[PDB]
Symmetry: D2
Subunit: 258 residues, 4 copies
C-alpha cells in the first residue's frame, strides 16, 4: 500500500511521470565541493525540466553526521531541492530526519526489519536499495515493512543482482515486477554496472531502463571520479551528465506515452 | 584475413547495428503450406506498413523447402531455418537465405564450418552457457572458413536454476565483435525446464541498440512462448519509435 | 606486518585447517537461562564423547552476557555471539571469546576494526555476494588493525534467485588466505526469501577440509533451518570419520 | 524406472556399491596411445579393486568412427573391460552399438529427445551428461526419455552448472537429488572444474563428491595433458591417477557404510 505518486518538495516520483533524478557524489566532501556538485546538477536538471534530489553519504562506511547536516541544510537554503542520504542505525534515522527529505536504506541493510521500521517511523520518504542477493518479488516483503509501519512514501531502487563471482547483472524484468508492487521504481545506473570486489556500460544500462519505464534514475557523479575518495570507478564524470540526461529524456518521452 | 561484415545484406533486407532494426519472425515449426502463407502475409503486411525488413523463419524438409521457395516467389523476402547437421546445411542452402545455428549447437565447429561453406548468411544463437565475448571464437569459425556474413543472436544466459537473464551489456560487447546483433525476445524470457516480459526485454534491447529482433509468433500460441500475431503491430510500432532514437545517438 | 594465524586458539579449543575439526554450535537466539544450559549441556556431552572442541553460540544483552558468563563457569568452553555495531563489540568483549561478523556486515570496515581492536577472536561470515578471494581484503581489515586471530566462515553464495550454492572450491581458496575456515552447514542450505541437505553439504565440506563446522541446532526447530539436536550425534560421528581421512592426506 | 544397479560387463554401478571408474583420454589418438592409456588405467584399477569403463571420443567435435571401433574392439579383446564413447546422431548410436557398451549423451545434447530415444533403442547402457544449463530435478524428464523408451540401464553424470560467466559450480545437492530418481550417479571431476571459454581443484571436487556418495567417477586423463589434442587443461596427468583414486577409495569405504 505504497503511494504510486511520491511527492518530495518540488520533485514528483511516479512510474507515470517524467523521470526524476537522484544524483550526487558518493561521499560528501568539503562544503566547497558539495556546493559545486549540487550547483552543476541543479543547473543541468533545471534546463531539462527534470526534478532533482541531491544525494551524498556522510558515513563512510565500508564527513560525519553533524557537519553533513549543516551542509545539507545550507544546500537546501541555497538551491531549494530535497536531499537524500543513507542511514545505517535507528539512531541515525532520528538524527538526520529533521533535515534530510529522503532516507535511504543501503543494499546491505535491506533485510534489517528494525531499520526499515525506524526509517518508516520518521515519516520521511524512504528509498530502499534492493539487495544484490534479493529477487524482485522479495521487495514486496521489504517495502511492506515500511508501508505496514504507517509510511506510504517508498521508492524502490534497482541496483543489480549477483551473477557468479565479481559480477552483477541487471534483470530488466525487475522493473515491471517492482512497479507492480505500487511504488515508484528508481534505476541506479552506477552501481548496477560495478564489478563487486564498468563506467562504459552506465549509458547502456540507463538506456535499457528508461525504455522499459522508471520513475527515476539514481546516478553517482563526481568531477574527477578516478581521484574521488570513495566509489570512484563507478561514478559518471559530471561533464558527461548533461549528454547522458538529454538522451534519457528523449527515450522517457516515448516510454511514458505507452 | 576475412573479418565479419558489420553490414549484412540478405535479399532485400539489411542488417547493421547502425541501420534501422530489421525483423526475423515466424512460427516455431512450419505447419501446413496454407499456415505458412498466412503467417508470412500477416507479417509482411505489418512490416510493409512500418517500412522494416522482414526475414520469414520456420523450423522443419522436401515439402518445407517447396513451401519456402513458394513464399519467396510470392512475397520476395528472404527466409531462415535452423540446421542441425552438415547434411542439412547442404540440403537447405539452395533455397534458404539464412542458415541458423541453434544455441545448443553454437560450439559445434564442424556444423559452423559446414554452414559457412554454403555461402549463405549464418545466424548463430548464443548458447545460454556462453559469455558475450565467447562469441569471438564462435564467429571466427565461420569467418576463418571464408564467410563474412554472420549474425549473432542474444537469447539469454543461465541464471541459477530454471531461469535466464538478459544482460544488456551483451549487446555492445557482441557489436564490438563486428557482426550485426539480433535480440531474441521470445527465447530470452524462457523458464528452462513468461510472454508478459517479451515487451520489457524488447524495449530494453532496442534502446541499447540492435541490428534486429527475432520473435516467434503464432495466431494461437496456446495450441501451437510465442507472441500472438495480433500483438505484433503494437509491439513493433513501439520498438521502431525507440530504435529511431537509439540509432541517432 | 601482522598476518592471519593459521592456528587460532580459543580457550580450550584449537581451530586449524590442519587440526581435527572443532564445532561451533548452539541455537539461533538465546531464549531463557534454562534453555541455554540445556542446549549447551547436550552439546558438551556429545563433544566430550567424540573428543571435539566446542564453542557454544547464541545471538541476543545484560541478561545474555550473564548467561554466557555462567555457561562458561559451569562448562569451561568458549562462546560466540554476533555483533552489529561498534558499541556492541565493546559491550560483549569482556565476556564473549569470539565476536561474529554477520554475512550482511562482512564489508563494514568500521565494525571489522572495532571487533579487531577488542583483541577477541573474530569470525567473519562470508557475504553471499562475495567471491572467496574477496575475503583477502576483509580479513586484512582485522589483521592490519593488529588482530591475528580470525576465522573465515563459508555460508553459501547467491545462485540465481532465492537460491544459494556451496562452491567447495571456496574452502581451499580461503584456507590459502591463511585463516582457519569454518563451514556453516545450516545457512549454506538456505532458500533466501532445506534441512534435508545439511548432511550432504557437511560431508562434502569435511572431505575437502575445514577447521570447523558451524551448525545451528535446537530441541524443537519448528517452534524456534536448524538441525534438531537429536540428529547431531549421528551427523558429528560421520563428519569425524571423514575428517580423520581428510586431515591425514 | 531406472535400474538402481547397472551391470556392464565386469563392472557394477550402484549408489550402494563401491565406486566404479569411467576414465580415459578425451579423444582417441593412435592405437599405441589407446593401448598405453587403457593398460595403465586397467593396472591401477585392478590393484585397487575398482571396476573400469574405458572411454574415448572419436568425434572431435566442437580418429573417425570406423577406426575407433576397431581399436575399441581390440582393447576389449586385450583387456576385457567395457568401453564408452559419446554419440551425436541417431545414425551414430546404431553404428557404434555393436561394439560400445555404454553410449554417452554429451552435455550439449541432453535435451535432444530423439537422440535419447535412439540411444535407448540400442539396448546399451546410456550415460547422460547433465547439461550445465539444467537443474538436478530436470534430469527426471531427461532420464525418463530413456527409461520410458524401454531401456532401464541409465547413468546420470554430474558435470557442473553455469555460474555467471566462464565459471561452473558443483552443487553437491545434485547428487542426492539425481540418486533419488533411481539411477546410479556419476561425478565428472574433470569437467566440473573447467572454465568454460582448474586442474588444482579436481581432487577438491572429487573428495566432496565421494563423501556425499556416488556410484562412480568420470575422470579424463592423459600422459601429457598440456600437450593433448583436446581438453588438455582439464585432464588429470595419468601418473597422478593412482594417488587420487587411493584417496577416493578411502572416503568411499566410509561413505558407503552410511
Amino acid at each position: 500500500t505504497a503511494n504510486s505518486t511520491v511527492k518530495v518538495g518540488n520533485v514528483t516520483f511516479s512510474n507515470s511521470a517524467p523521470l526524476a533524478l537522484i544524483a550526487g557524489p558518493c561521499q560528501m566532501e568539503t562544503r566547497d565541493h558539495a556546493f559545486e556538485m549540487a550547483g552543476r546538477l541543479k543547473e543541468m536538471t533545471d534546463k531539462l525540466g527534470i526534478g532533482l534530489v541531491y544525494k551524498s553519504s556522510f558515513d563512510k562506511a565500508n564527513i560525519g553526521l553533524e557537519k553533513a547536516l549543516e551542509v545539507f541544510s545550507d544546500l537546501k537554503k541555497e538551491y531549494g531541492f530535497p536531499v537524500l542520504t543513507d542511514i545505517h542505525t535507528e539512531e541515525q534515522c532520528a538524527a538526520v530526519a529533521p533535515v534530510v527529505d529522503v532516507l535511504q536504506i543501503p543494499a546491505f541493510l535491506c533485510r534489517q526489519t528494525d531499520l526499515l521500521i525506524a526509517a518508516a517511523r520518521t515519516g520521511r520518504v524512504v528509498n530502499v536499495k534492493k539487495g544484490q542477493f534479493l529477487a524482485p518479488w522479495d521487495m514486496k516483503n521489504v517495502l511492506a515493512k515500511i508501508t505496514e509501519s504507517g509510511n506510504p512514501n517508498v521508492l524502490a531502487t534497482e541496483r543489480g543482482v549477483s551473477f557468479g563471482y565479481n559480477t552483477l547483472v541487471s534483470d530488466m524484468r525487475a522493473l515491471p515486477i517492482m512497479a507492480g508492487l505500487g511504488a515508484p521504481v528508481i534505476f541506479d545506473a552506477t552501481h548496477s554496472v560495478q564489478q563487486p570486489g564498468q563506467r562504459e556500460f552506465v549509458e547502456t544500462l540507463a538506456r535499457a531502463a528508461v525504455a522499459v519505464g522508471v520513475a527515476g534514475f539514481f546516478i553517482e557523479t563526481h568531477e574527477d571520479p578516478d581521484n574521488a575518495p570513495s566509489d570512484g570507478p563507478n561514478m559518471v564524470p559530471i561533464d558527461k551528465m548533461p549528454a547522458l540526461l538529454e538522451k534519457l529524456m528523449a527515450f522517457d518521452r516515448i516510454a511514458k506515452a505507452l
